[PDB]
């Protein structure tokens, strides 16, 4: 899976686009990276950042990670409204960026724009339990080792950084050339963005417009209708969870979000 520069800056620029036009802010998915918007960001006509997921990101709650992604965003652009949009695991965090938005501003209505990309504030036995269980889903994607060896490596260490060193050991003996921190920091930082994206619930109704961009290779909305009470825009969008941000899949997101982005 991906990886990222844990030093690296929590706002990315995604395109070379330089203009006052405010800018088109994109919310990582849960590897942290912002790299799966290049293409997305290469077509539009007006600056795209991303937001990535750093050592300096709080991953206490979804609604620290979206307070922390809103001040950055806004010393790139000090005034509103604010197009934000976040992709699979990034689209909850996105959608509590614009309700924290709505909150500040309440009650004159916000005009924020928010896609999201195949995502949802709804699609995204104790504590050894749970890191094990995240720390063996991340190494199971790094190695080939059967869900059960995983486990009985992981389960009996002492704790949450004895769990990551010896998950970056298992992945390093699969493949050496991959970089220790980096693997030590996505490691840790997937258990911390697993619990925080399952501990997450939204403090109010969303009075915003959404828009839904789903895979068409797989509820109809990802639940958007219990959680918003303002216009829910669904688009079937060509490929599967992770090609519908490419190709034919983007090329129908572009013409869908042109008028938007003018």
């Known amino acids: 899976s991906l990886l990222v520069n844990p030093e690296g800056p929590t706002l990315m620029r995604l395109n070379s686009v330089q203009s006052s036009e405010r800018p088109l802010f994109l919310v990582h998915p849960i590897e942290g990276s912002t790299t799966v918007f290049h293409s997305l960001a290469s077509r539009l006509s ?5 937001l990535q997921c750093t050592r300096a990101a709080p991953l206490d709650s979804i609604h620290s990670l ?3 992604y809103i001040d950055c965003i806004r010393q790139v652009q000090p005034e509103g409204p604010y197009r934000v949009a976040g992709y699979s695991y990034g689209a909850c965090v996105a959608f509590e960026m614009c309700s924290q938005l709505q909150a500040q501003q309440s009650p004159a209505p916000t005009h924020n724009s928010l896609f999201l990309f195949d995502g949802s504030p709804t699609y995204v036995g104790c504590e050894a339990e749970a890191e094990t269980e995240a720390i063996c889903f991340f190494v199971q994607q790094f190695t080939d080792m059967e ?4 486990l009985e490596a992981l389960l009996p260490l002492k704790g949450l950084e004895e769990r990551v060193a010896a998950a970056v050991d298992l992945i390093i ?18 258990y911390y963005k697993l619990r925080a994206a399952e501990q997450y619930t939204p403090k109010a109704k969303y009075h915003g417009n959404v828009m839904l961009l789903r895979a068409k290779t797989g509820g109809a909305d990802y639940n958007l209708s219990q959680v918003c009470d303002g216009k829910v825009s669904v688009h079937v969008i060509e490929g599967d969870h992770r090609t519908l941000l490419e190709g034919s899949g983007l090329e129908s997101i572009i013409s869908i979000i042109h008028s938007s982005l003018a």
Do not use: C, M, W
Request: hydrophobic content about 35%; glycine content about 6%; aromatic content about 14%.
């Open 46 to 50: 007006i600056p795209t950042y991303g």
């Open 66 to 68: 979206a307070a922390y």
């Open 147 to 150: 869900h059960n060896r995983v």
């Open 173 to 190: 003996k699969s493949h050496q050339g991959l970089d220790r921190q980096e693997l030590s920091f996505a490691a840790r930082s997937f």
